[PDB]
């Protein structure tokens, strides 16, 4: 009668690390639409994975620049504010314990004829 071929996750079929079942559950639970198609959560999970990889990549680069092996919020803020597209997308977001980018307006510094 029933054979029960072994299970395989949707993430592995899609070649993703982020899940699909949970995203589907979250779309159903949250009043987004009456029904949710099978392809929507794959596309969304892939998008979330790419953007996560982009932030983690730039933050790890900033970490190596400061000779640190662990990513802290400061590195994420530096990564975002130095990247035009991430800065635009996250223009109204505050990263806790992130600080600010170094920036002194040129006219407030003393004149360079000092010697």
């Amino acid at each position: 009668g029933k054979a029960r071929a072994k299970a395989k996750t949707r993430s592995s079929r899609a070649g993703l690390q982020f899940p699909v079942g949970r995203v589907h559950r979250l779309l159903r639970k949250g009043n987004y639409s009456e029904r949710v198609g099978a392809g929507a959560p794959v596309y969304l999970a892939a998008v979330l994975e790419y953007l996560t990889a982009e932030i983690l990549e730039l933050a790890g680069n900033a970490a190596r620049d400061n000779k640190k092996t662990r990513i802290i919020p400061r590195h994420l803020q530096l990564a975002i504010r130095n990247d035009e597209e991430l800065n635009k997308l996250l223009g109204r977001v505050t990263i806790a314990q992130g600080g600010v980018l170094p920036n002194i307006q040129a006219v407030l510094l003393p004149k360079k004829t000092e010697s």
């Binding site: 919020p73 505050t94 806790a96 314990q97 992130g98 170094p102 002194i104 307006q105 006219v107 003393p110």
Partner: protein, 101 residues
């Protein structure tokens, strides 16, 4: 008494800028902020309690708001061929961002 060292105005200010822009620690004392929060909340509802992380979150939000406003204020000051920020600069920054009152 003999030949005492004294830095010129601006050097130490710049050193403080460099220092605080390099670090991320919170600059306001926790307890006075807690007392301010409790006073304000008390004027809306009595005997309120607070989680410690709620106060820390408010501190982060407040400081981010002030730093952004001081940056805009500084650009307004520089625009007027000045280097000193004045109340009229804050009022202008607040008006353009739409934080009118």
């Amino acid at each position: 008494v003999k030949k005492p060292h004294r830095y010129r105005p601006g050097t130490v200010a710049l050193r403080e800028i460099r220092r605080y822009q390099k670090s991320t620690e919170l600059l306001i004392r926790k307890l006075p902020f807690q007392r301010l929060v409790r006073e304000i909340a008390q004027d809306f509802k009595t005997d309120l309690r607070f989680q410690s992380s709620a106060v820390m979150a408010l501190q982060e939000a407040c400081e981010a708001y002030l730093v952004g406003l001081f940056e805009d204020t500084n650009l307004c000051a520089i625009h007027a061929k000045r280097v000193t920020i004045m109340p009229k600069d804050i009022q202008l920054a607040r008006r353009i961002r739409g934080e009118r009152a």
